[PDB]
Amino acid sequence: SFEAKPSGSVVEQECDFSPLLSGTPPQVYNFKRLVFTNCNYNLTKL
Amino acid sequence: DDCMQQICAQYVAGYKVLPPLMDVNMEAAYTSSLLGSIAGVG
């Protein structure tokens, strides 16, 4: 028998950046680092 | 067509069902002719 070729596969699989843009930024000596792991990141927003 | 809208043998592929090779209407015609003949034969 002839079977249709597979196509259009459907595949099924948000760290907030608000503290960086909000509040008083600390001085260069008091630089504040935020750790983000395994989270969606938007470069365009920054 | 109904199965696509939802037998499933063609989609499974596995085994293909085969038609009897004799149409039901043709078989019915043979039986009706036999019914006529039996009255004459008896």
Automatic annotation (TrEMBL), chain A:
Disulfide bonds join 15-39. It is found in: Virion membrane; Host endoplasmic reticulum-Golgi intermediate compartment membrane; Host cell membrane. Glycans are attached at residue 42. It comes from the Viruses. Specific enzymatic cleavages in vivo yield mature proteins. The precursor is processed into S1 and S2 by host cell furin or another cellular protease to yield the mature S1 and S2 proteins. Additionally, a second cleavage leads to the release of a fusion peptide after viral attachment to host cell receptor. The cytoplasmic Cys-rich domain is palmitoylated. Spike glycoprotein is digested within host endosomes. Belongs to the betacoronaviruses spike protein family. Spike protein S1: attaches the virion to the cell membrane by interacting with host receptor, initiating the infection. Homotrimer; each monomer consists of a S1 and a S2 subunit. The resulting peplomers protrude from the virus surface as spikes. Fusion peptide 1 (FP1) and fusion peptide 2 (FP2) function cooperatively and have a membrane-ordering effect on lipid headgroups and shallow hydrophobic regions of target bilayers. They are considered as two domains of an extended, bipartite FP. The membrane-ordering activity is calcium-dependent and also dependent on correct folding, which is maintained by an internal disulfide bond in FP2. This is Spike glycoprotein.
